[PDB]
């Protein structure tokens, strides 16, 4: 018998995530205009379908692009996805606030690049949201006069 099945419940970790660091065996991939110079926005984990949806932004040819990638889990425990080639992604460390991952990418020219990354989650607690809504109500502010800055197209550019 090899290893045994892993009880996986990551649905909980879905939400807004941000890129902290990304390292690469090939600097070109993460330098300005590189395909893996990715600013994460959101991650959605589905435990039933065994997938992870990645939502991030990348600058290409002087233009900003919003990308959506779907990764599928394997018996291996790793995830596979198509993006600037084929990718095999492993979650090395994971908690309610951080994710440390390792990714192997093989581009259309058979070139292999290994990347490491650290992402952090932007956690918004129910207790704090309640405090905000009560205060907002106390000041007579209408719900329609509240702006969501976490999920909004019009935002600053990191570069």
Ligand X SMILES: C=C[C@@H](O)CCCCC
Ligand Y SMILES: C=C[C@H](C)CCCC(C)(C)O
Q: Which token pair is 124?
A: 């918004």
Residues composing the chain: 159
Contacts of 44 (CB under 8 A, 6+ apart): 14, 52, 53, 55
Minimum distance, C-beta of residue 115 to ligand Y, in the bound complex (Å):
4
**Is residue 71 near ligand Y by the rule CB under 6 A?**
yes
Find the binder of ligand Y among 38, 43, 73, 99 (CB under 6 A). 38
56: alpha, beta or left, given left = phi > 0 and alpha = psi -120 to 50? beta
Find the binder of its own copies among 4, 48, 93, 96 (CB under 8 A). 93
Three-state secondary structure call for residue 137: helix
Q: Which of ligand X, ligand Y, its own copies, none does 2 bind, CB closer than 5 to 8 A by kind? A: none
> What residues does 64 pair with on adjacent strands?
59
The contact set with ligand X (CB under 6 A) reads 22, 38, 54, 69, 81, 83, 87, 89, 101, 103, 115-117
Binding positions for ligand Y, rule: CB under 6 A: 22, 36, 38, 54, 69, 71, 81, 83, 87, 89, 101, 103, 115, 117
């Amino acid at each position: 018998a090899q290893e045994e099945e892993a009880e996986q419940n990551l649905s909980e970790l879905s939400g807004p995530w941000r890129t902290v660091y990304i390292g690469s065996t090939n600097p070109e991939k993460i330098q300005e205009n590189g395909p893996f110079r990715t600013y994460f926005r959101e991650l959605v984990f589905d435990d039933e379908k065994g997938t992870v949806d990645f939502y991030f932004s990348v600058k290409r040819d002087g233009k900003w692009k919003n990308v959506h990638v779907k990764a599928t889990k394997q018996d291996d425990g790793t995830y596979v996805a198509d993006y600037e080639g084929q990718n095999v992604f492993k979650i090395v460390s994971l908690s309610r606030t951080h994710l440390v991952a390792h990714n192997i990418n093989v581009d259309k020219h058979g070139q292999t690049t290994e990347l490491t990354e650290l992402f952090v989650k932007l956690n918004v607690e129910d207790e704090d949201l309640e405090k905000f809504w009560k205060l907002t109500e106390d000041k007579g502010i209408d719900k329609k006069n509240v702006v969501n800055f976490l999920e909004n197209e019009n935002h600053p550019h990191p570069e």
